Each structure stands twice: as structure tokens, then as C-alpha cells.
Amino acid sequence: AQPIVFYDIPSNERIKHSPWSPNTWKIRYALNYKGLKYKTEWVEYPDIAGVVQKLGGKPTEKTPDGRDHYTLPVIYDPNTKKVVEDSAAIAKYLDETYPDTPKLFPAGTDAFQAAFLDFAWPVLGFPVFMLVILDTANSLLPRSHDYFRSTREQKFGKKLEELATEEEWAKVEAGLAKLKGYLDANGKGNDLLLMGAQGGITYSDIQIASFFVWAKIIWGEGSEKWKRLISLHDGKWAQFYAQFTKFEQV
Amino acid sequence: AQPIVFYDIPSNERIKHSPWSPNTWKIRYALNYKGLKYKTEWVEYPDIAGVVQKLGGKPTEKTPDGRDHYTLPVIYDPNTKKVVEDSAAIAKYLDETYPDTPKLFPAGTDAFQAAFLDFAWPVLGFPVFMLVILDTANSLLPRSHDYFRSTREQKFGKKLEELATEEEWAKVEAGLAKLKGYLDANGKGNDLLLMGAQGGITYSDIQIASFFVWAKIIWGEGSEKWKRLISLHDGKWAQFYAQFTKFEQVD
Lengths: 250, 251
Description:
alpha+beta, Glutaredoxin, four-stranded mixed sheet, two-stranded antiparallel sheet, 6 strands, about 50% helix, about 10% strand, globular
């Protein structure tokens, strides 16, 4: 098979040009986990719409305001000659197109995973976002920085400098506490993967991991903030996140 | 096997003394679906704490004021001499103790179901509650009515008569739209059960059904409100809910 072309958002020297996006990381994980050959193309935030349009790709939402909205990740698969967008749809596409690779959506789990993914941002992703949003902006190349800051300050209604608070830390921990509770339902020895110790990694597991790798890269693995996050709940998340270490090829 | 003793909340003549509670119906559904023999013991709302305590049962919630809260459903299984409380725990008990019966928590699904169940009330259950809560209260025996009105008005901060609104109808439809979206992920032919057409009924499916059976019994199957609810999304929920009719036996 030829390498898949994977479209990602670049960064500056603050984080040594590392990929960072929680949304593109879901697909970077998916590709690394499946052992699929790919190459990364870097697209600045304000250039994403033009790039995806030229590819013949589609917007991932149309707002009541009438306007189309383009997002990364997107892939071009030379093996099928197809452009695929929207992370959950790409992951499903990779399952179907490369069936000999580990399945991210095991049969019978698609609806349960959709529900789980629909609450991943509200309960965990958003509070994390608040704690990393300023540092994220300061990790972008200047053009992406201006676009990102402009658009996100409008979205959240405050300067980026105001969004990280002790309250958000409490909300992060509270979200992880809910997650911990769901996992507890699996029983001891099965509470570090959504489908249990023998169930393998699902797309939903990747969704959680992607919030962690985002924070680690943005804050820095030696940082006090990363240590604080990963130490929550007696080291549970350190153990959870450890399962993804071998799938972070860049 | 001796019948399991199933503790449920009774009703008055308005609904012909039918069982009605969405929470106890989850376990009535579980028992009916598994084909297990049981008999119902009726307990009024203010009598629940006393009855469960006497059984040697436990409270299902302990608040930061330190006070215990007892709830139904509860079962006493004479065959194991165990009292089991909390609907999700009762369902799991029934899986483990009665392995020859169809599973409500298939292996690998417990966490996904815990997550789903945690979304079920905020996104669908509560808006339905607002639309059926007055009629629910007016289907209770007088002692249960008094307790239910007092406690539930305290919780929701308005008289029961004020809780049903058109905005709640919008919220019910929006919650169902989200659920429709999740089921669509299973693909055509597989979008009427969470695990697909041949995946069997799960506890999570029963959770959704229990909101429908509650509304049907409380409003009446021939009512305009029931018709409106079950007509949403071009009748999808009529088909979803029809899968459960054969499991609505009442002793």
C-alpha cells in the first residue's frame, strides 16, 4: 500500500514543531495503532478551508448562519483515491478499508461509542481546552496564532489569557472522576480500557488519550501542569495514558 | 425456583393500579425479558425506607449531609437469600446469578453502558419527567402523593402543575434526536437497538424503553400526548418501543 497523506496543523519552536491538535491526534493515533504508512502534510489554520476545498474534500459542519466550516484532520488515501474528513468518519473508514488492522469500532459498539464521544468534549475536553488554550495559541506559527486567537476569543467571549483557572482544574478532575466511574463498571483489572483489559483499544479510548497527549505536548512533559494532570486519582491516568506510548510516532 | 420478590410503587384507579415507575420498570423489564419468576410487593413512597431497612437492604445514595436515601426497585431473591438494590446493580446481579438468561450487560460493554446511562436522564429522562410528573403524582395513592409532591416540588423548585411546558417537548425531541444520531452510527437495519438488530436487548436499551412505558401508562395509550411523543421522527420511536411490548407482563 502507498502512504496515506495525513493533513495536520503545524507548530513553532515552543514545542519543537510537534503535532499537537487533540482532533488530529485521534487520527495520528489511529494510523500509528493500525501500523499504516502515512506522511504528514502541514496546513496553517487560515489555509485549511482552501486546502481541503482544493482536495475536493467536504466541510465538517454547515452553520445556521449558512456558512461551511472546514476542519483538520483530513486524509487523502492514494490506495482508494479518496479524500476523507471528520475524525470519527476517518477512523471508521480506516477500519473498513484496512480490515486486517485492529478494529477501532468493534461490531456492536458504534452507537455506544457515538454516545460516549458526544460527551467526551463537554465533560473532559472543554475544561482541558481552557487550561491549554493560551499555551496552544503561543505554540502556533504567527498566521495560525492570529486566526486561532481571533476566532477562539470570539467563541469563548474572553481573552485567551483569562480562560485557565483553578475552577477549570476542578472541572477537569470532576470529568475524569466520571470517566473513572464508567471504567469501574468493568471491574478490577479491566478498568483501564473501555472494553476491559482484553478488549483492545477503541476509538473512544483514543478520544481520551488525545486530550492527554495534547496537554502533555502543549505544557511539556516535564512541566508542573502535566505532572498535576497525570497524578490525579492516585496515578490512574498515568497508567491509562501509558498504554498509548508506543503509538506516538511523528 | 421460588419467585423473586420484586418491590414496586403502587398506583390508584387513574391508571387502574398499574405499575408505572420508570426506575422499577427497568427491573420489571429485566425480569420479564429473562423469563424469571417473580411476584410484586407494593410499597408506598413514604414506606420505602422502612421496608428496605427491615429487609436488611441498603440505601442507594448517601448525601453530603450524611443522610441515607432508600429507593425502589429492590429485590429479595429467596433462592440466594440476597437483597439487591439499585436498578443497574440488580440487572447485573440477574446476569451473573442467572447465566442461562439473555445478558443485559454483554462482555466488554459495562463501561460504555455506564456512560450511556449517565446521559440517559439528563438528555431524555428529565424532559420526559417534566411532561409526566403532574399526571404521575395524580396517579399515586394519597400518602405517596403527599410525599412525592413535597419532595419533588422541593427538588424542582416549582409546583408540579408548572413543570410541563412546550420547551420540555422541544427538549424531549432534541434528546431523541441525539439518540437517533447514536443509533444511526450502527447503519441501516441496525438502528433500532444500541448493539444492532442481532445484538440483543441491553440494559441501556431497557433504560430508554422505561421512559416510554412510563409516559404511555401515565398519559394513557389512547391519549393525544402519547400519540405526539410516539409520532416523533416519523414514527421511529414507535418501532423502537414496539420491541418491548412482549416484555410488559404484569403479575
